[PDB]
Design an enzyme around this catalytic site. Sequence first.
Site, PDB file in Angstrom:
ATOM      1  N   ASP A  13       2.881 -10.701  18.692  1.00  0.00           N
ATOM      2  CA  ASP A  13       2.398 -10.402  17.339  1.00  0.00           C
ATOM      3  C   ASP A  13       3.220 -11.014  16.211  1.00  0.00           C
ATOM      4  O   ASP A  13       4.445 -10.920  16.209  1.00  0.00           O
ATOM      5  CB  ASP A  13       2.341  -8.897  17.160  1.00  0.00           C
ATOM      6  CG  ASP A  13       1.216  -8.289  17.929  1.00  0.00           C
ATOM      7  OD1 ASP A  13       0.174  -7.979  17.308  1.00  0.00           O
ATOM      8  OD2 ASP A  13       1.261  -8.134  19.166  1.00  0.00           O
ATOM      9  N   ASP A  28       0.838  -1.169   0.000  1.00  0.00           N
ATOM     10  CA  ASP A  28       0.000   0.000   0.000  1.00  0.00           C
ATOM     11  C   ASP A  28       0.888   1.239   0.000  1.00  0.00           C
ATOM     12  O   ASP A  28       1.640   1.462   0.928  1.00  0.00           O
ATOM     13  CB  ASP A  28      -0.958   0.009   1.178  1.00  0.00           C
ATOM     14  CG  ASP A  28      -2.080   0.972   0.967  1.00  0.00           C
ATOM     15  OD1 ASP A  28      -1.821   2.105   0.543  1.00  0.00           O
ATOM     16  OD2 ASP A  28      -3.258   0.678   1.146  1.00  0.00           O
ATOM     17  N   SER A  59      -8.128  -1.701   1.689  1.00  0.00           N
ATOM     18  CA  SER A  59      -7.516  -2.681   0.796  1.00  0.00           C
ATOM     19  C   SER A  59      -8.062  -4.111   0.982  1.00  0.00           C
ATOM     20  O   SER A  59      -8.606  -4.662   0.035  1.00  0.00           O
ATOM     21  CB  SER A  59      -5.979  -2.628   0.876  1.00  0.00           C
ATOM     22  OG  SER A  59      -5.500  -1.285   0.888  1.00  0.00           O
ATOM     23  N   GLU A 106      -1.081  -7.915   2.204  1.00  0.00           N
ATOM     24  CA  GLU A 106      -0.824  -6.485   2.137  1.00  0.00           C
ATOM     25  C   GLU A 106       0.234  -5.979   3.108  1.00  0.00           C
ATOM     26  O   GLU A 106       0.113  -6.152   4.334  1.00  0.00           O
ATOM     27  CB  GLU A 106      -2.111  -5.719   2.392  1.00  0.00           C
ATOM     28  CG  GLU A 106      -1.948  -4.244   2.157  1.00  0.00           C
ATOM     29  CD  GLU A 106      -3.060  -3.411   2.724  1.00  0.00           C
ATOM     30  OE1 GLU A 106      -3.909  -3.886   3.520  1.00  0.00           O
ATOM     31  OE2 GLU A 106      -3.073  -2.253   2.337  1.00  0.00           O
ATOM     32  N   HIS A 142       2.578   8.697   4.863  1.00  0.00           N
ATOM     33  CA  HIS A 142       1.628   9.722   5.353  1.00  0.00           C
ATOM     34  C   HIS A 142       2.187  10.516   6.529  1.00  0.00           C
ATOM     35  O   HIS A 142       1.914  11.709   6.675  1.00  0.00           O
ATOM     36  CB  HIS A 142       0.292   9.084   5.774  1.00  0.00           C
ATOM     37  CG  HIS A 142      -0.583   8.684   4.626  1.00  0.00           C
ATOM     38  ND1 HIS A 142      -0.966   9.565   3.642  1.00  0.00           N
ATOM     39  CD2 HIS A 142      -1.143   7.491   4.302  1.00  0.00           C
ATOM     40  CE1 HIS A 142      -1.729   8.941   2.764  1.00  0.00           C
ATOM     41  NE2 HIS A 142      -1.842   7.675   3.133  1.00  0.00           N
ATOM     42  N   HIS A 181      -1.285   2.639  -5.213  1.00  0.00           N
ATOM     43  CA  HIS A 181      -0.919   3.961  -5.691  1.00  0.00           C
ATOM     44  C   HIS A 181       0.400   4.269  -5.037  1.00  0.00           C
ATOM     45  O   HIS A 181       0.888   3.510  -4.186  1.00  0.00           O
ATOM     46  CB  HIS A 181      -1.935   5.011  -5.214  1.00  0.00           C
ATOM     47  CG  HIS A 181      -2.131   4.960  -3.747  1.00  0.00           C
ATOM     48  ND1 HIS A 181      -1.222   5.509  -2.871  1.00  0.00           N
ATOM     49  CD2 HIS A 181      -3.040   4.296  -2.993  1.00  0.00           C
ATOM     50  CE1 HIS A 181      -1.598   5.233  -1.635  1.00  0.00           C
ATOM     51  NE2 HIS A 181      -2.705   4.513  -1.679  1.00  0.00           N
ATOM     52  N   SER A 217      -7.237   4.146  -1.449  1.00  0.00           N
ATOM     53  CA  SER A 217      -7.085   2.694  -1.342  1.00  0.00           C
ATOM     54  C   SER A 217      -8.363   1.934  -1.639  1.00  0.00           C
ATOM     55  O   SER A 217      -8.308   0.778  -2.074  1.00  0.00           O
ATOM     56  CB  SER A 217      -6.642   2.321   0.071  1.00  0.00           C
ATOM     57  OG  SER A 217      -5.376   2.874   0.349  1.00  0.00           O
ATOM     58  N   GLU A 226      -5.841  -7.965  24.940  1.00  0.00           N
ATOM     59  CA  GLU A 226      -4.431  -7.643  25.026  1.00  0.00           C
ATOM     60  C   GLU A 226      -4.200  -6.307  25.728  1.00  0.00           C
ATOM     61  O   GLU A 226      -3.143  -6.087  26.315  1.00  0.00           O
ATOM     62  CB  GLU A 226      -3.856  -7.607  23.613  1.00  0.00           C
ATOM     63  CG  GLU A 226      -2.349  -7.456  23.530  1.00  0.00           C
ATOM     64  CD  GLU A 226      -1.853  -7.546  22.102  1.00  0.00           C
ATOM     65  OE1 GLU A 226      -2.682  -7.580  21.163  1.00  0.00           O
ATOM     66  OE2 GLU A 226      -0.633  -7.605  21.908  1.00  0.00           O
ATOM     67  N   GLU A 242      -4.377  -6.798  16.731  1.00  0.00           N
ATOM     68  CA  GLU A 242      -4.438  -5.532  17.441  1.00  0.00           C
ATOM     69  C   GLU A 242      -5.873  -5.061  17.388  1.00  0.00           C
ATOM     70  O   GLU A 242      -6.656  -5.552  16.549  1.00  0.00           O
ATOM     71  CB  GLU A 242      -3.525  -4.492  16.794  1.00  0.00           C
ATOM     72  CG  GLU A 242      -2.043  -4.693  17.037  1.00  0.00           C
ATOM     73  CD  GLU A 242      -1.619  -4.543  18.492  1.00  0.00           C
ATOM     74  OE1 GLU A 242      -2.052  -3.593  19.172  1.00  0.00           O
ATOM     75  OE2 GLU A 242      -0.793  -5.359  18.941  1.00  0.00           O
TER      76      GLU A 242
HETATM   77 CA   LIG Z   1      -0.950  -7.575  19.609  1.00  0.00          CA
HETATM   78 MG   LIG Z   2      -4.310  -0.529   2.563  1.00  0.00          MG
HETATM   79 ZN   LIG Z   3      -3.307   3.090  -0.311  1.00  0.00          ZN
HETATM   80 ZN   LIG Z   4      -2.861   6.167   2.126  1.00  0.00          ZN
END
Ligand SMILES: [Ca+2]
Ligand SMILES: [Mg+2]
Ligand SMILES: [Zn+2]
Ligand SMILES: [Zn+2]
Lengths: 480, 480
Positions: free
Chosen positions: B285, B42, B155, B311, B320, B358, B92, B216, B270
């Site tokens: 994890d 992603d 996604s 993904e 970001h 993207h 997305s 958790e 999570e």
């Molecule tokens: Ca965890």
């Molecule tokens: Mg995604």
């Molecule tokens: Zn994305």
């Molecule tokens: Zn994004």
Amino acid sequence: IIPVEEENPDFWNREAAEALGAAKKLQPAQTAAKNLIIFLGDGMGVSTVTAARILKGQKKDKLGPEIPLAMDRFPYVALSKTYNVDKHVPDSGATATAYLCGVKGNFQTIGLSAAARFNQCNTTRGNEVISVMNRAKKAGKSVGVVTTTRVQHASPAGTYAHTVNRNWYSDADVPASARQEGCQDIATQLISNMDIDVILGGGRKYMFRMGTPDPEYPDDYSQGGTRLDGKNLVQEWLAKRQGARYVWNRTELMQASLDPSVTHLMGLFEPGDMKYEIHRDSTLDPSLMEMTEAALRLLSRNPRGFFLFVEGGRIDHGHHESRAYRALTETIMFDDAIERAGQLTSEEDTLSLVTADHSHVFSFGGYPLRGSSIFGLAPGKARDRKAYTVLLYGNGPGYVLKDGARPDVTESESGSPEYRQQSAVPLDEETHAGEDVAVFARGPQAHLVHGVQEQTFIAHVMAFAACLEPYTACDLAPPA
Amino acid sequence: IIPVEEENPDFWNREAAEALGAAKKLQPAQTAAKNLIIFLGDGMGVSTVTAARILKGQKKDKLGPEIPLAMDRFPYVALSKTYNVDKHVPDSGATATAYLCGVKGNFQTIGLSAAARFNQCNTTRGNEVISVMNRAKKAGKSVGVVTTTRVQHASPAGTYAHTVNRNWYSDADVPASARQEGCQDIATQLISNMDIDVILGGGRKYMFRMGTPDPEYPDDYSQGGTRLDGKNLVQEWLAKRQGARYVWNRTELMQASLDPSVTHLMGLFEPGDMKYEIHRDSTLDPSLMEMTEAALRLLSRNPRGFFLFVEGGRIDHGHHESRAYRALTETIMFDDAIERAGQLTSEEDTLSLVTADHSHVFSFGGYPLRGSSIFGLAPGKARDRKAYTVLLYGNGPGYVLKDGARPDVTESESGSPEYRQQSAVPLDEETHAGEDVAVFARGPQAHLVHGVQEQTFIAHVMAFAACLEPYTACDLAPPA
Ligand SMILES: [Ca+2]
Ligand SMILES: [Mg+2]
Ligand SMILES: [Zn+2]
Ligand SMILES: [Zn+2]
Ligand SMILES: *[C@@H]1O[C@H](CO)[C@@H](O)[C@H](O)[C@H]1NC(C)=O
Ligand SMILES: *[C@@H]1O[C@H](CO)[C@@H](O)[C@H](O)[C@H]1NC(C)=O
Ligand SMILES: *[C@@H]1O[C@H](CO)[C@@H](O)[C@H](O)[C@H]1NC(C)=O
Ligand SMILES: *[C@@H]1O[C@H](CO)[C@@H](O)[C@H](O)[C@H]1NC(C)=O
Ligand SMILES: [Ca+2]
Ligand SMILES: [Mg+2]
Ligand SMILES: [Zn+2]
Ligand SMILES: [Zn+2]
């Protein structure tokens, strides 16, 4: 704007079904390439290609991104890794060595292995690597160099020169010690290293002695000859070739390109680089497309074929100025030249590769609506409550602080041909970028252009396809 | 640093000769794909891939750019055009619709044609487009969704959901009017729309009623259940499947993945998105690589094959934040997962595509030396006589003015995992980018992945390769 036709899933299903049909029809040639063309978009990275596509699509009557560029129609694509041996983010000289000679070299050298060192004349000898254009000539093909820069600029120079210093345009640029050591300026190398049938672009000034008025700007002395050794290289070049013609303007180019018995053509159309297409005098100067047609007219006469180098050389320059308008308009003209060459040659016998030497720190972001100008503002204000552009640079000369803050920008401003998009870091020139660039390929052995490759692969596949170079024992049938 | 071996042209000539040999050996399959895997990075554009390669190369004992990523080894590459119907720079959700359902849609919708409108529940019906994962399930294959984000994120949601609003994670997010109109939150859609054999990632909270302590983080109420309708969706999911198991930690995942008779596995690790790999608790994890192996253990048991979605979902999130360290470390883990899946499956019967939804306004520039850290400073000062980084963003939250000017930056600072690279334009979040992304492909019918394609092509080639969807009359022999 949402195009109504695209709201129907069958629009997309139809297109993709058509795409699969075409993908399935693709077959490898068993025959060699008679002709070889490399189109080099200098600085034309993936973000430049997409942005250019959108602009061109809108130049037509369309929304933008859905309209293929001519280069988009090429069936085979690879990613090219552009690092020079000594630097991750390369220059045009050492990438030229890679995509034209098939060997990576050090930053700012041309046609030399990485055993050479920049600006050290005495590291030259033994490290010359011969271009596939040179090798095409040795095999009897006609060869052509076409670019919107000086013909002695790093990219075209990669086809014929070997120098530790790309800045050595004329003897005026070479230090005495290097001149004494026999390192020739690029203009001399242009006329001496090998026979070149067609040479079209800028760079008049380096061919003539100081004092020589430029024919087109006889009243601007800075445009005159630069040489200190008394040589007229144009005259020397003409003298060693029968059928040779020199032109400096478009009308003379036209006459020459149709003149049978013009066998060698040197067209130098500006003192230095050619003007941006948007500034081109269409009476005095040929566009890149026109120059590549002129080249093809002459080169196509050889029954053994040709190698042609065509460069959109000022895409790069547009990005360095952080003027995306200039970068993208150069890219469209580059694409038009690719389209034109495709009209004038057959993919049955011509291997055409489109690529870039490297990219730029150019990005296309915000969340602009479909059909919006590529030179427009991103919808919605930035965190400083001022507008920003969809096109931006990581660094370069569009970094501005107007009384202590990032300046607002309007649509009329953002859309001006002189507009410099903002960057994060002020530099006199925006910097190249180091990410992979595309290779597009069509013609005999184009299917070999695949995956992720070193940039050197470009030279080797072209040499292989034409059964040149170290691949004379290609195992290919004669060209179709 | 100049690697001595690369100074010799034969180094490059040998490599390229090897590259040509391999290129020539490539042959198209005549057989269908039993299995389908899409790996979705992603936000993983071309600049992210190259930067990641350099980092990973150095993580090993190498200089960087010369070392292939696992994805770099895939033979077939295409450029994917990512625009949504309504916006040039996509999200997305609507790209998911393209690469998972084979139809482009409008920004922030998922699994719907572009006849739908964002956040307008009453434009949903009739516009649902069915994913190739759904179609794989209909054909008897086992199906798996694996991601480092919430499994209800845009996604993975593209594999199973249809919604006018990607933000509708649980019923808590859906306006009353839309709930009344029967638009289901994504968590409900996750358990109701189709049978999914393996679901691994984050997003615990949306499955449980408000008041439910997260197992958790039982002492952080913001991590608890979000639902207002009283439903325990995990319990509802378990109840409608025999062999079903739910896990929320790594050790339980391990046990389940080796437990024959666990036929359905839901692992939500999570409350929301999984932690960045650099922050992952390796006792509690699973990494992305570990989750994709867990999925493969279960999915590979079906003799009819499987469809797997994997993904690298937080590459995007790193960008970001304009923290390239997080973006690139996520990309390396994504590449490791790709490598691992390659070890656990055969390209004789498995079509694997790696792509991105993207890109981002992320650039890699300056002129750094070979072997230098990707997180380092460009050689030489900027025009304001202060240092700058080789990695930059067009926009985003690394734009800083410290008392009225761009701040200097040091190597220790630039190299910190929390460091935000500078940008030209301040935004809370750095923006996606609209340029083409790569598609890498290996396996049966992978050769069809070529040229420059609409992003929808990804869904269609996968459906075609497996003889699903509208291509049941593929004309392919049974999987090898
Ligand atoms: Ca965890
Ligand atoms: Mg995604
Ligand atoms: Zn994305
Ligand atoms: Zn994004
Ligand atoms: C090149 O010349 C410089 C300047 O005199 C000298 O220091 C250096 O050793 C020379 N290198 C070679 C390869 O001769
Ligand atoms: C083009 O060049 C020729 C000299 O070869 C010259 O006679 C003619 O005037 C030039 N045309 C223009 C418009 O300058
Ligand atoms: C969707 O509902 C809104 C709000 O009442 C209404 O204005 C609009 O006309 C509706 N559209 C459709 C397709 O029914
Ligand atoms: C993992 O989950 C199980 C419940 O399924 C629990 O008993 C165990 O304590 C958990 N492990 C950790 C380390 O929290
Ligand atoms: Ca002129
Ligand atoms: Mg150039
Ligand atoms: Zn360049
Ligand atoms: Zn440049």
